[PDB]
Structures are given as C-alpha cells and as structure tokens.
Write a protein that binds this ligand. Structure first.
Ligand SMILES: O=C(O)C[C@H](Nc1ncnc2c1ncn2[C@@H]1O[C@H](COP(=O)(O)O)[C@@H](O)[C@H]1O)C(=O)O
Ligand SMILES: O=C(O)C[C@H](Nc1ncnc2c1ncn2[C@@H]1O[C@H](COP(=O)(O)O)[C@@H](O)[C@H]1O)C(=O)O
Ligand SMILES: Nc1nc2c(ncn2[C@@H]2O[C@H](COP(=O)(O)OP(=O)(O)O)[C@@H](O)[C@H]2O)c(=O)[nH]1
Ligand SMILES: Nc1nc2c(ncn2[C@@H]2O[C@H](COP(=O)(O)OP(=O)(O)O)[C@@H](O)[C@H]2O)c(=O)[nH]1
Ligand SMILES: [Mg+2]
Ligand SMILES: [Mg+2]
Lengths: 430, 430
C-alpha cells in the first residue's frame, strides 16, 4: 500500500566499519542500490572473487549489472572525480555502468575551488591553532556550506541554460576568493570541463523524487541504501566540530532521497570489532601503543581515499549505544572479528568516568570527551583462526561470547559477523 | 517496545498554512511538544479564548502548562530574540515557561552578525541582480551555512569554558567581516550579552538525544513535533534557491531531534485552501489581481514575523502531491476554508503545461517553474458562512465537494477542516 520499505546500512562509529562489504553482500538481489549523503570523501571497499574495488561516489552495488545504482539529492558531486572513479573501475572490468547509474537532478555540485578552499581552510586552521579538522580535502565541507547558503549549484542547473549557470559559477567563485584571496580559480577553464561533463551526465540524470517514489509504489522492489561516514561523524550528532558535513545517521536517508520514514525498513548498523578513527578529534579508547599497532597492522587500517594511517582502539560501547539511540538499528553487522584472532585478551569500553564519577550520557561537548577516563571490561581471546568461519557453530567459544557481549550491552541483535574482506567471509546468524 | 511514535505537523506549501493552529489543537493532551528545524524566522499564530499568540522559537505548545516544550538540535537559536519573544508572551499571561522549556545542548547559535550578514547578503543580491531571496533577515541562512562548515557554535559551547567560546566567537566574527568588510561587529559587546544568556539558559539546557530517547522508551508518552516553514521551502526539495536553509520535510524531524524513523507515527500535512508565498520565487497559481487582493485581504495574509504582504493564489495540487511524495502524509488539515465562503467559483491548479505539453513531475529547476502554464479546474463556490461549522454535516454541499476534491486528487485523507483562527474553529472529520 504505502509502498516498499528500503533497507539501510549505516556506520555506527567513525566510518570504515565495512559498509562497502555489507552493502555488496545485500545488493546481490537488490533492485536498486542508492547513496544518500556525503561525496567521494567516502571510501567503500568491496571484495568479490579476488577483484577488489574502492567506491567513493558510485554506490557499492554498481558492480551488480542487474541492479540499478542511484545517487540521491543529499549527495554532493565533484564531476571530475566521478568519472576518474568510473574509469578506474572500468579498467577493473566495470562495463556499461552508465547504463545503470541514475543521478538525482537535485544533487549539489562540488566545484574545483571547493576542494581547493577545503585544503586552504585546513592549512589555515592548522597554521593558526596547531590543529585542524583532518578533512579528506575533497571539498565536502565547502560544498555543503554553499548549499545551506543557497549559493551552491545543482545537477539540473548544469543541464539547463549554460550561460545562466556560468553567471552563477562566477559569482560563487568570487565569493570564495573573497574569503581566500590567495585562491587561484581558472574561471573559463573549469567551465569548459563542466560543459563537457554536462553532456556526459545528461543521459543518467533523472528526477530523484519521482524516481524513488515510483520505485517504492510500483511493483514491489528491494531498495538498498548505502550510508556514508557514520554516526559519530554526523554533522549534528557526531563529535562536532570534528565531523563530516552531512547527516550520516538514519535521518539522512529521508532528507537525502526524499522518502518518508514509513518507507524505511531494516536499518543495519555496521560495527567494527575494534574502533578506528581517521582524522582529528576525541577518541576515548584510542591505543597509542603496541596493541594499537597490532590492530592498525592486522587490520590494514589506512585511508581508502587518502591513504592516511587510521588511529585504532578497543571497541567502545558508549558511542555504539549512542549511535543506536539516534539510528534505531534493527540488527548489527559485526566486522573484522578475525583481526582479534590473535589476542589473548580483548578490552572493551563500557562507560566514561569524569573526576571519578561516571557520566550519564555521551557528551555533546567534544572537549569533555577528551578528558573522560574510559572504564574497561576485559574478555578472553579465542586465539584461533576464524577467517574460515561460515556459520555460528564454527566460531570458537570466546569469539561467540564476544559476539554476545556486543549484543547484550547494546540491546541490539547481531545479524552478521565479518571474518574477512571478501563477500563470502560472512556469517549470517539469522 | 521500540518505543512511542511521535506525531508530526508539517507545512505542505510555502508555509503559513496554519501550523501553529493545528499544533495548538493537538498539544492539549500532549506530554511533549517539540521544534526540530529552522529558527525564529518561523511565525506560528495560535488563538485560544480571545488571546492571540505568535510563536517563533517557542514551540506552540508552550501555552500548555501541563506539557513540556522542547527545542531540538536542528534548531538554530538567536539568544536575544529568544527572550524578546518569551517576555512579549509573558505580558500576554505566559508564566513559569522557563519551567517547562527544554533546550537541546546541540542546537547551533545564531549570532548578531549572522542576522547582519543575512541583511547584507540580501542587499548585495538585490543591488547586483535586481532580485534577492526574500529572506526574513533573521540570520537563518548564515547560521546554517556556518553549521555545515563546522565553524558555528552550539549551546554546549556557550555553557562551557567561556574563554574558549570567546576565542571561537572572535574567529567566526572575523571570518564574516572577511567576506563582508562593511560589517561592524562589537566583539566584546555581543560577548557580554552571550555570557549573560548563558546563565539564563543553563537551567533549561539538557542532552537532547538522551532526553528524546528516554521519553520515547519510558512509560508511553504523547510527543508532538511542530514543523517550521514547509515542503516547498525545504533546502533540498523546495524551489531552490528560493527556499529556507533547513529541511522542513519529514526527514528534518529525524535529523533535528535524533529519533529513528520507526518512532515517527502520524505525519499531518497542513494544507491551506488557497496558496500563499511570502518572499521571492516561482509561484504558478499566483493571482496578481482582484481575486488575489480578496484572498490576501479576507485571509489577513501578512507576515507574522516581518509584516510583509504575502502573495496569494489558487490552491495548487502539483506542489501538494509533490510534498506528499516527500513527506508521506497520513492525513491532511485543510485550513482557511472560510476565506473561500464568498467566492462564486474556486479555481484549482491540477497540472503544469510547457510549450503546450503537460510536464510529468514537479520541476527541480525553479526557472522552468516560472514558465509553466497552469492547468485549472473550476469548482462551484458554496457562498455561505462556514465560520460557525463544527462537524462535517454543517458544511454546505460545495464546501464538502471542495474537501473531497482535495482528498481525491491527493490520495490522502482530510482529518481536519479549518474554519477560523481559534482552536474551536475546527472540524475533525474522523
Ligand atoms: O582517510 C580516508 O581515506 C577517509 C575515507 N572515508 C572516510 N572514512 C573515515 N572518516 C571519514 C571519511 N570521510 C570523511 N571522514 C572524516 O570526516 C571528518 C571530516 O572530513 P570531510 O568529510 O572530508 O569533511 C574527518 O575527521 C574525516 O576523517 C576512508 O574510507 O577511510
Ligand atoms: O514573512 C514572514 O513573517 C515569514 C514568517 N515565517 C515564514 N513564513 C513563510 N515563509 C517563510 C517563513 N520563514 C521563512 N520563509 C521563507 O523562506 C525563504 C528564505 O528565508 P529565510 O528562512 O529567512 O532564510 C524566504 O522566501 C522566506 O519568505 C511568517 O510566519 O510569515
Ligand atoms: N579482515 C577483515 N577485513 C574486513 C572485514 N570487513 C571489512 N574489512 C576490510 O576493512 C576495510 C574497511 O574500510 P572501508 O572499506 O572504508 O569501510 P566502509 O567505509 O565502512 O565501507 C576494508 O578494506 C574491508 O575490506 C572483515 O570482517 N575482516
Ligand atoms: N480565517 C481563518 N484563519 C485561519 C485558519 N487557520 C489559520 N488561520 C490564520 O492564518 C494565519 C496563518 O499564518 P501562520 O500562523 O504563519 O501559519 P503557520 O506558520 O503555518 O503556523 C494565522 O494568522 C492563523 O490564525 C482558518 O481556518 N481560518
Ligand atoms: Mg571508508
Ligand atoms: Mg508562519
């Protein structure tokens, strides 16, 4: 009646939890796989039959030639990067993707100078406070800021009267040079490429509202929504201001695709068995030591977009439970359990104490978070190779206890356990 | 189990549909009445027992001394205006409101210079294109733009180390003067007030996430959510760029209060019997004539915030059906039906034609919208006084047909019919 309900895959920590993996797995029989917020600052790794892919703007289901990939109005798109990405995956075998890629005509555009201002703002904050955000420098913040200001431009603007567009492009370019006089912008040059992309994107563009709506009310379809970033990186709920500039939480699905809450079915939270954070900001369970090195190393924890080394720490339940209050997860996907195969003991943060007393809830003030003392619980390691596990029974005793521990302390059920990078390295628990 | 489901009241056109009225009516037995997006740019009129109120930041349920009013993290707050408003309503009888007003510690702050830059940006766009946005000049756009940029400041920042806050305040102040050198900012002066407000707001501040979450999972409660602005004014879905800078659509409820889609129950769309738009932008059914004057006049259509005269036009189903695709309304509230009591004929826009051919869906490109030819349907007036109506039976034949016409063409049911400004001037149809 009201229509089909989409399935959502969201990050529950600070990203890189394995969203590409979970989405790839669920997109096998999906009719539509979509992306709702963020840009190519996102980096999702998919592994199927040896071949490894790293998607940024392309929905991770772009591999499925039977499914339709959709980029929603909440996404911010840098045209050059978009094709740079598609062509790189073409070389990996991706063919006729422009045949199954639809782009919402309301999605905003990330311009060359946006990524430029992004870098400049980072160097300015660093060379003025010794500390900056840790941005991926993909111009995400500047573009979302132009959007809220209503000065930004969108897909439909590029595909319309080009002369009109150009007049706006120039005004926006200037507006930036104003706040950053040391910014160089080849107005006429960048516009030449944008005119070229216009005709390259044209055939794929569609009205997103009508598109999603038609799909959710026509003959039942299986629609999958790929989140980007994660709960604690959410512009509203994350460790502000050390967050990304979009809503990575479940609400972002509605505002980013134009679908009402009743068309939202299962909302899966991707939970990494340990915590990682790439960029600046508070991180309670962070491990700057041998154990931190072993997680970073055994987990190959480096940017799939920037190449930066990620910070690593024990699992942290304070952020997870917080993420659950905002997203209302219906089941979890616990990834990279195998990374813990070697440990004799695995610590997990259960609460935060301040001045001796335990704090009641996750702090809105990030600076506070930088001073909390994490209260840990120590669990026994299983000291066994789980990379070959395929069913609940395979996992040794301690591994199973660790899975329950996450379950119980979150009140949410674990539906999948990740034991490898490839699609097959999964254990559906129900 | 998952918890209670909140009731949402949203605008289906370009605002001023009567949201304050519908919310006041529903808040009588509400445990919590909240506000999720926008700022005091919003203007909601409530009428109960002669006394008339116009709320801007205060949830319209702030009148109910038994219910709790909540301002969510999606809201942008200008401290001065906040109290200017509360004190004005105190004079009208509002007492001990600070006792039942809770403010999310994650809500961003609108600073004096924001409202200043807002005005300057408007004069600049006008004195450079002969056309500006039509902003209420309440600094909404500048504040949301600072938010996306992560340069903005929040409630929790004001309530924390003031010296720290001040350092940021100054950096943000400068950032603005940079793009607007003709901007005067009394850094030390504005900071003196902000320090005063800090202690004035302190007692009401709480953690919004924990707050809403606790309410939705504790003993069942009736939570009401007051939308601001409306669908066609939505930053993503409205007539961009002639929109407001927040998500007025249903998704805004989730991102603005931190609650997952499953805790969203009824979503009511407030539909005015004719269409009004205050500000610049395309408006297909606009009536610049005698009929336009009669609606503006009989409907007292002037800004409840600015005092500006609103533009008026016939009901427009293209925007309404579009609004429904994004919000997924469960029932409608058709307001100001009485305004039509005098007309011998009432026209309604059913579709948009371009170059002779009918367009398939509401256009993402606003400029197109400025050239569409509206296709009208003419209905017979009832030529009778409905202001005294209180039940379906009271309404004359033509009035009832008009209510059905809205129903049928939208596929959504009309649950309330407004016949006056006061709470009692309502007809619940089911
Ligand atoms: O390092 C990379 O390659 C990042 C890439 N994608 C992301 N993964 C993890 N965190 C991410 C991502 N994108 C944004 N962020 C974090 O958001 C913060 C703001 O940066 P931005 O979004 O560029 O404005 C900032 O703290 C970012 O680190 C990945 O797959 O690893
Ligand atoms: O005129 C008034 O008093 C407005 C007041 N509240 C609103 N009612 C109707 N439209 C509104 C409101 N707030 C914002 N807008 C429209 O949003 C557009 C952008 O302006 P802004 O939100 O100030 O950035 C711009 O087109 C605005 O007209 C009211 O109750 O009438
Ligand atoms: N060993 C192992 N690696 C995994 C597992 N799940 C995911 N990974 C890898 O962990 C990395 C996570 O980074 P990323 O792709 O950015 O995650 P996303 O941003 O959430 O999609 C990828 O290289 C994945 O292939 C798992 O269960 N085991
Ligand atoms: N005559 C009449 N006036 C109404 C009715 N419903 C609302 N109004 C008035 O119409 C105006 C709508 O403006 P506004 O309060 O900004 O609506 P909101 O922003 O949606 O809350 C207010 O002055 C209301 O009192 C109705 O059914 N009849
Ligand atoms: Mg990643
Ligand atoms: Mg109003």
């Amino acid at each position: 009646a009201t229509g089909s309900r989409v399935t959502v895959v969201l990050g529950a920590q600070w990203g890189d939890e394995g969203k590409g993996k979970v989405v790839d797995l669920l997109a096998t029989d999906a009719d539509i796989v979509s992306r709702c917020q963020g840009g190519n600052n996102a980096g999702h790794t998919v592994v199927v039959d040896g071949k490894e892919y790293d998607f940024h703007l392309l929905p991770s289901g772009i591999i499925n030639t039977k499914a339709v990939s959709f980029i929603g109005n909440g996404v911010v798109i840098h045209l050059p990067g978009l094709f740079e990405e598609a062509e790189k995956n073409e070389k990996k075998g991706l063919k006729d993707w422009e045949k199954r890629l639809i782009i919402s005509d309301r999605a905003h555009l990330v311009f060359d100078f946006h990524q430029a201002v992004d870098g400049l703002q980072e160097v300015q904050r660093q060379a003025q406070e010794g500390k900056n955000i840790g941005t991926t420098k993909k111009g995400i913040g500047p573009t979302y800021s132009s959007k809220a200001a209503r000065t930004g431009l969108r897909i439909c603007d590029l595909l319309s009267d080009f002369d009109e567009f150009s007049a706006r492009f120039k005004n926006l370019a200037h507006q930036h040079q104003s706040m950053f006089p040391t910014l160089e912008i080849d107005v006429e040059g960048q516009l030449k490429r944008l005119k070229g992309f216009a005709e390259r994107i044209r055939p794929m563009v569609r009205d997103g509202v009508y598109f999603m709506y038609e799909a959710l009310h026509g003959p039942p379809k299986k629609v999958l929504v790929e989140g980007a970033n994660a709960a604690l990186l959410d512009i509203d709920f994350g460790t502000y201001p050390f967050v990304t500039s979009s809503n990575c939480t479940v609400g972002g699905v509605c505002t980013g695709l134009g679908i009402p809450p009743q068309n939202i079915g299962d909302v899966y939270g991707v939970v990494k068995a340990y915590t990682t954070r790439v960029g600046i900001g508070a991180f309670p369970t962070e491990q700057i030591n041998e154990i931190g090195d072993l997680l970073q190393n055994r987990g190959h924890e480096w940017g799939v977009t920037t190449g930066r080394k990620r910070r690593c720490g024990w699992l942290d339940l304070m952020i997870l439970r917080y993420a659950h209050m905002v997203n209302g997860f219906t089941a979890l996907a616990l990834t990279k359990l195998d990374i813990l195969d070697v440990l004799s003991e695995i610590k997990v943060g259960i609460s935060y104490k301040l001045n001796g007393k335990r704090i009641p809830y996750f702090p809105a003030n990030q600076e506070i978070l930088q001073k909390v003392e994490v209260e840990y619980e120590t669990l026994p390691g299983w000291k066994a190779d789980t990379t070959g596990a395929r069913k609940w029974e395979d996992l040794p005793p301690q591994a199973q206890s660790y899975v329950r521990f996450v379950e119980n302390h979150m009140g949410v059920a674990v539906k999948w356990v990740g034991v490898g990078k490839s699609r097959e390295s999964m254990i559906q628990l129900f």
